[PDB]
Amino acid sequence: MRECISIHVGQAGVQIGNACWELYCLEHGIQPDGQMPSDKTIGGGDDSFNTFFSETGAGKHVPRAVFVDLEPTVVDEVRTGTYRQLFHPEQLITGKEDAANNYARGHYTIGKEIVDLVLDRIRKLADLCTGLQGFLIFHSFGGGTGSGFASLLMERLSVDYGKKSKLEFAIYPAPQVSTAVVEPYNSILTTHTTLEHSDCAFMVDNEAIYDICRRNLDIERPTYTNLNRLIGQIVSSITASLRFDGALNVDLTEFQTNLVPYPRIHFPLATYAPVISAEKAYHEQLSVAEITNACFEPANQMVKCDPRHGKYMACCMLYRGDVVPKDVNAAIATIKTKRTIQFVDWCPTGFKVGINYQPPTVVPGGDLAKVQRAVCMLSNTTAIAEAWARLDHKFDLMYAKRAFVHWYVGEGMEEGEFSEAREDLAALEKDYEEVGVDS
Amino acid sequence: SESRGSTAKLNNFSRLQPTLHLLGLQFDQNVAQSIITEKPGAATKLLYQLYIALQKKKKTGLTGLEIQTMQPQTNLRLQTLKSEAFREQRLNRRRQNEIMAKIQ
Amino acid sequence: MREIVHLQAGQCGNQIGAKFWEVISDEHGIDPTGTYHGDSDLQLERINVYYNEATGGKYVPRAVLVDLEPGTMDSVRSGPFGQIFRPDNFVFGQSGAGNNWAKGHYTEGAELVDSVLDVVRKEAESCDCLQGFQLTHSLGGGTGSGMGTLLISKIREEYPDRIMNTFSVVPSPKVSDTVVEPYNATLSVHQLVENTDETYCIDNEALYDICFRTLKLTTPTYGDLNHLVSATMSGVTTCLRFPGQLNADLRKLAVNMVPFPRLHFFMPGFAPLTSRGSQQYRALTVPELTQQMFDAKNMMAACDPRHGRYLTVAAVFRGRMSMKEVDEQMLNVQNKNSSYFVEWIPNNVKTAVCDIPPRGLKMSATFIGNSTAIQELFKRISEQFTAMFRRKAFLHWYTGEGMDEMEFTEAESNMNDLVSEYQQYQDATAEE
């Protein structure tokens, strides 16, 4: 049935996968041992866990995910954890040499060495599953492991399965803050691969996460754990109608078909809400109209872009928790008449209604409080094109006299790829501009 | 359409009403009642009002289309035309019944 | 004997069908187990229309559930009456429709269609003689609209001498569930006007507005709309289910209120739609029912019939009142409201009273008519289709399936012809 396989490449991908798995096990009552030792007091677990987990003959659960990394330090860090008894060591492939924010090595001289093993692993995992719809590839554009290895693996998975959905989840180099320097070098080469060889791509950064956490959660000392929790909540909200049911189930295909207006424009704008802390979730009346209106506020977006600069192509609304249809209808009636929100003269309306009976849960030790209902937004607008424009400007300004390029030359790769990626991104920006222009 | 069949008269009056109201004259329910029942005086009175208003148009200055600068008219008259059609139906609630008797 | 085979398509179609089955089981006195628990008289003779006789008096339903997603059958089976149906009729695929009509018709409409044709053929051969086939679905997705038209075409090709009545859900620009919804409505309307006897317009926004401004419900949900459509269906079908003095049947209704086969759309509507606190202060009489069936407030339309002229009107009553009141009421309405119906054709209202009152309610009566109000929906659908087809947005998905774009061109030509026909028949003048 509705079963999917998750792919985790790089340190960020591995940590995101761990956060997702721990969230799933805590929300489904799955104990870290892998069995059900709860023989005295039950606390749930009688549901459809086959979507992500598997049931053995002895009452054991096996996670279905791919944990690959070129550097063994992350593998060892996860291995020495308290959840080591859950997964299998064969799912965690170590490596001698790593990329560490380098594309040429991890695409030619490092990633090409471990290919057959991961292919056999994913073939075994697919054979272990009956129904397959899409994949959950977790990587990063800054990390060389999540850029070179991810590109070479997805180029083969695309030619091995043309009928299966190919998703994407990674991190965008923020214009203001950054971690490394050669991040756009890997980004300019990864974007072409993700555009001309994938169906959809989700783009997020960390600066907006920092802004929203300091503005709502009001933390002076953030940490990666909160970011991972937010990402896992987003992923769970997106894939909510798969593990469970509701009034109107929304599968991966159901929203993916409409979320792609054109083969070249497949970069939606996610928006999770409410992103609030404990004290921010008690003295505050929560309805649907307010949170839906807040979803279109630029301050709550995880991409730094003003929606008012462009206009929307396609909108996809999702909901999770006790939601009443009349509230959704009233919110739709309100937003459709809002003059602030812009749109084209050709799409008066389009959206989805995903009602999920199971409300979002909480975690002991986390920052998210107990909210009766949740909402997730995936919209398509041209105002986000500035990020690619800024990235192209950076690539042009640092490619003028070839800063930090001689290494890529010595490793072995064509210099013409830089110009090819540049012209492809220029054409993509031109297409975005043309689509944004109305009559 | 001049035909004695009152559908032709409906066609005529549907266009006559806004023209009656480009002057602001009251196209009146009892006026149409006397039109169909042929009570002398009402339609004649409105026609004479229109006649002397034509004389007013020819008296000093602007044509009726240029007269619109005096007092803004078509601010609610857009709704008035539709209400005129609906009130022509309402006049049908009493007047067209005899015509429909032969057609039913 | 004379039995009606019921069909299911689309998740919304499945839920409304389950609601209708539960409603009729409760009305006719059927326990959730499967036996009989009624206490009436006409609930044993003509009970075989929707049921089948088996050992121990355990009647079985007659409805085939067609779907592409296995998640709907689990949802509908866990209900209080989900254990009584035939699991063999639950023919579900493995891949969802993805709100695609072309993909659902081509990929998921080739290797799965054989089973449903086989089972419906078996059901048809099981009985002696039949009248028609009822299919309840929605145009919002590739499940209802994707295979409902194909199944209707197949059954018309196999058995041309049957009734094809459906209750598909029309879309609305104000309340949308699919981005490519006008594409799917476009594709479905062609099959509806080419290979379908009759069709009834179903809207959710109008029902929501009705239950908000008149019923005044606290938390209106899909269950309320399912109950309302089930009640409307029961009131429509009581003409044959419970015979009375002036009984009617589906085929007579279809012949009498369809002036032209190209125009077979209708306007359904119930009447006693009152709030909870008003139920104990009401006057059960004829003029009130006539007023609630004539005004545009109680109709389930996201439109206004006052913009056009009434073409065909049928008032189906269900109770024990009289005969003279209905005719005098319609006479004085036609006398007064003369500019609301076609003048060239008198007596556009059909009289029909069911002597058997429904269970739980004494006075019930539905309103089935074809007024001139769907024209704006048709023109707005045509406008939105032209707008999105100009630059060909969201078209690569359909192109990759294999079907070309000429289908859209011929479809839009067909709607242009149909709307031209509708507006030039709207102003049906007597003579030159």
Explained architecture:
Chain A has helices spanning 10-27, 72-79, 103-109, 116-127, 145-160, 183-196, 207-217, 224-238, 240-243, 252-259, 288-295, 325-336, 385-398, 406-411, 416-436, and strands at residues 3-9, 65-68, 92-93, 132-138, 165-166, 169-171, 202-204, 269-273, 312-321, 373-381. In chain A, 43% of the residues are buried. In chain A, helix 3 (103-109) crosses helix 5 (145-160), helix 6 (183-196) crosses helix 15 (416-436) and helix 13 (385-398) packs antiparallel against helix 15 (416-436). Chain A is of the alpha/beta class and 439 residues long. The longest helix of chain A has 21 residues, at 416-436. Helix content of chain B is 62%, strand content 0%. Chain B contains 5 helices and no strands. Chain B has helices spanning 6-20, 29-37, 42-59, 77-92, 97-103. In chain B, helix 1 runs antiparallel to helix 4. Chain B is globular, with a radius of gyration of 15 Å. Chain C has 432 residues and is α/β, with parallel strands linked by helices. Chain C is built from 15 helices and 12 strands. In chain C, helix 6 (144-158) packs parallel to helix 7 (181-194) and helix 13 runs antiparallel to helix 15 (406-426). Chains in contact: A-C, B-C.
Features:
part of a larger assembly, 3 chains, A: 439 residues, alpha/beta, 5-stranded parallel beta sheet, 3-stranded antiparallel beta sheet, 15 helices, 10 strands, globular, C: 432 residues, Rossmann fold, 60s Ribosomal Protein L30, Chain: A, Helix Hairpins, 7-stranded parallel beta sheet, 3-stranded mixed beta sheet, 12 strands, protein transport, microtubules, axoneme
Q: How does the helix and strand content of chain C classify structurally? A: alpha/beta
CATH class of the largest domain in chain C: Alpha Beta
Annotation field: number of helices of chain A = 15
CATH architecture of the largest domain in chain C: 3-Layer(aba) Sandwich
Order of helices and strands of chain A: EHEHEHHEHEEHEHHHHEHEHEHHH
How many domains in all of chain C?
Answer: 3
Shape of chain C: globular
PDB class: protein transport
Keywords: microtubules, protein transport
Entry title: In situ structure of the central apparatus in mouse sperm axoneme.
Chain A: Tubulin alpha-3 chain
